[PDB]
Amino acid sequence: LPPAPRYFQGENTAGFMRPVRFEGDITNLEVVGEIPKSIEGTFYRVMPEPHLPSFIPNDPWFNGDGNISGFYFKDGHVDLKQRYVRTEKFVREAEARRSLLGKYRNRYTDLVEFKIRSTANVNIVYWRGQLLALKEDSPPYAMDPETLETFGVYDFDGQLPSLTFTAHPKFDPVTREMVCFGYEAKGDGTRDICYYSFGPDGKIAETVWLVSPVCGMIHDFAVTENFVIFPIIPLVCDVERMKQGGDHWQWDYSIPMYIGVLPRRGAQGSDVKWFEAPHGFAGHVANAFEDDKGHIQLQMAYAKDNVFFWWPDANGKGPRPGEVEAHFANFVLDYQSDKLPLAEPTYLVDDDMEFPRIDDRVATRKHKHTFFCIFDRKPGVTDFEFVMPRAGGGAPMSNGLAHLNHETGDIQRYLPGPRKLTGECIFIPRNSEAAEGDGYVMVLLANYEDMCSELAVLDTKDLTNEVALIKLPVRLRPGLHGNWVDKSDVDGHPAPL
Amino acid sequence: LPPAPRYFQGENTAGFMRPVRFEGDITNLEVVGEIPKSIEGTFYRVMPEPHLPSFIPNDPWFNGDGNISGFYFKDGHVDLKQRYVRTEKFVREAEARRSLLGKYRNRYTDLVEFKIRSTANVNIVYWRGQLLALKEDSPPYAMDPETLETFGVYDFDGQLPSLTFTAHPKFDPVTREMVCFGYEAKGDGTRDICYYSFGPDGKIAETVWLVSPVCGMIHDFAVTENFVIFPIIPLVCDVERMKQGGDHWQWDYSIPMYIGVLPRRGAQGSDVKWFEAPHGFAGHVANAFEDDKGHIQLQMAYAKDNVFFWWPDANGKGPRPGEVEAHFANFVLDYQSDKLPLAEPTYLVDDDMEFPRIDDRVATRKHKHTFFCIFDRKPGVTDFEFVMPRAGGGAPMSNGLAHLNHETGDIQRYLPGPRKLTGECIFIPRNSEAAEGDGYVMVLLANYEDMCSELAVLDTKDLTNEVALIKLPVRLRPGLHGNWVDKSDVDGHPAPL
Ligand SMILES: Oc1cc(O)cc(/C=C/c2ccc(O)c(O)c2)c1
Ligand SMILES: Oc1cc(O)cc(/C=C/c2ccc(O)c(O)c2)c1
Ligand SMILES: [Fe+2]
Ligand SMILES: [Fe+2]
């Protein structure tokens, strides 16, 4: 077999990116300031964190075993529980005590035949009394919210119609449905998209098979009252390239950014309209809604070049690290229009941003608050001379959060400091009567001075001020998505406004 | 109640001394070099590590909750498991989410009434299929060697005759007995010493009650074929002082270092002879044995002033940090002699040393190898300018190990490096046929550059060279004692030479 290294090497596992690989508990975390005593619930987040050194050199960040963190809050106290998802990959590699899975989404490079290749490392959501650890090439892995035990691959009582389940399902706060899809829904290189939904009782509602114009990456999607919307990143899969040991994904400069629109209920596959936005990268969706005219307002991060620059085009053409900025874009779509080309979007702010969150009590409806990561290159905001030698590589960087009020246009910015960077934030309603966007924001910080992680708690009344700073004595490696599960919400999701 | 701080403050919990307080697992530790594939077994060590900030300012290191590390070795791979001893203190404080136990060994300062005050934080030994987590003011806590679950307070099937069990029992490699004692054996301030032993079947053998000349600290003891030996540190307990909120221990410059000698079998309490060594501090015993004449050779660390300087004399007189050195001393005792005063000891080496280990296959018999911690103030060995600002306080420092060959007088020194310090080492026989002192040495390092811990593996053929360096991504706080449990030893202890 290819030799198994016995320690981590390469920039993607250097400095703050070095895997820790701890599972267990740290109770009664140290707190500076004061956690609001009324906060009660759990912040779950997932990070890629390779359990064993890869036999693939410079294995991408996206290919690391999913490790789940839970921060359990009650009466101003907080405990951490941490556990790896017991994926097939995790278990078989742990048994062998060496890496067996090869390149990102390329089964032809695996040292053994896997049934499920999930690292379950992208998102961690709450559904009907379980956590679902998500990875868009795979079904979810179900886990216990209290103990973080892995139950196993989850197929929704045999109802799951797709081989794949998106990392970005949407929770309709009015219908209490989970709205889902999978792309490459029939396997590697397939153009099949399966759109499906589950009612609050767990029974499958929608199931619509449609066909993508290209086998492109559909990382995120959007849901409105009457439509679902599929933006396609111009990364394209060719299985013949994979069989020769090549990358699953390859940028294509010659195609638009397709945006499919399908009626949300009762549709057939042929009802989808593939609108064509200007070539660019479809980033995370903040939210989408239908306005007064019945037009879809789609608000999402959008860049003009390949954010995933390590997967360039066929001639190796693509940007360099730190070059591509994504901006908070508004696209307007009309399902009735027969014109496929879309205009350039309008932009809501100037900041280089990503990882937008809204008050999920208005998801699929008009929202007027968005919280998001920013990366400000203005001199002084980040001490790059100090941070970059300690940072390693392979992961995006955020040096603040921003809160946009869409009505007033006011923006507040939280800057943790010149030697700290942030992950994706969560929003917590102050209580069940709170106005939209009124409550608390939490965000995990990487402190490059201490080489430790911290969890900041902010009040939306003044995002610039930390109300509490929870000081972890270990590093939590840069992660991906996370969610709040409030103790007052029986089904884990907040009540509609 | 006295206010409970919500983060750690003071030098004793600063820098590398900051509690991490993690429990759980890190499998497949990163390894630089190569762990000898024949090594099979577990290195257990214990560290004081406060689970909650104390309400006592500058609480001594010795008063922190015992946290057990196990390093499980097989076929050149190693896993870490880590778990707190579930003492009464740990459990009740965890329930309350605040500190309740007060000053070191002073129940009159506790906020609630404890039955058992153990932090179980001094030593962790193997006996008849269990770990025993030790603290000299208490009975042992029994634990599972595989899972580190705490079973509870252990009383040897109701046979334990004493309130107290030493942190330094000795294992006779020929008789397979565990030889024990407790001081303050009938409660705070008592001069009662209970000497007792257990046969390999778990039945109590010896039980002899004797009386100390003063209520002094007997931290360690020594066992020969025919004698047991009790060196008394001139720290003295007055329960009336304690009732007023004072310290359990107070130095007394006016007394000798008593060394009691009792026949090992069949004795009465009045058979003890209290020899009087020159005033000084009784450090750890390497080993004791009877020579050809039947004289006891007692080899132990010995200092001329109070190593525990934070417990000074009645007028607050004593040394400052880093001032007192201890030296590897040989005392000669003759049980038949009626002369009580002893001569100054001879010294085996000149190094400032402590934490001596021998090949325990010759414990209680003549040994000719000792491994020990050293602290070398020779310029450059430790980069103090770099280390001391990162180190915190409250714990002793070791910047190397030494191996003394007692036949030849040869000394090898292992120096981990200018920005690393060491804990107490363990010795592992190469195999069951290995000569005395031939095999492997392991020692945990504090790396102040990375602010991480490492576990070094050395071959005794060349102690200056690391064969493997196991790289932990977390800190293990400076700890106390540890032990090797070899997989090839049915009762957990090595066979006699
Ligand atoms: O900074 C960004 C911006 C973005 O728009 C998306 C991502 C992550 C996407 C992702 C996609 C597939 C994976 O398997 C995976 O681990 C991660 C990260
Ligand atoms: O550096 C040294 C030298 C020494 O000779 C003894 C000790 C530790 C003694 C000790 C005594 C009682 C306790 O409760 C405890 O945690 C530790 C530490
Ligand atoms: Fe995402
Ligand atoms: Fe000791």
Residue numbers in the entry:
A (entry chain A), B (entry chain D): 30 to 526
Sentences from the study reporting this entry:
Unlike many mononuclear non-heme iron dioxygenases that coordinate their FeII centers using a 2-His, 1-Glu/Asp “facial triad” motif, CCDs use a 4-His cluster, three of which hydrogen bond to second-sphere carboxylates (Glu/Asp). While one coordination position is occupied by a solvent ligand as demonstrated by several crystallographic and spectroscopic investigations, the other is vacant because of apparent occlusion by a nearby methyl group of a semiconserved, second sphere residue (i.e., Thr/Val/Ile), making CCDs five-coordinate (5C) in their resting FeII states.
This difference in distortion was also manifested in the crystal structure of T151V FeII–CAO1 in complex with piceatannol where a ∼6° compression of ∠His197Nε–Fe–H2O is observed versus a 21° compression of the corresponding angle in the wildtype enzyme. Inspection of the piceatannol binding mode in the T151V structure revealed some small but notable differences compared with that of the wildtype enzyme that could be responsible for the different outcomes in iron center distortion. First, the β-ring of piceatannol is rotated ∼7° away from the Val151 side chain as expected based on the less favorable interaction between the piceatannol 3′-hydroxyl group and the non-native Val151 methyl group.
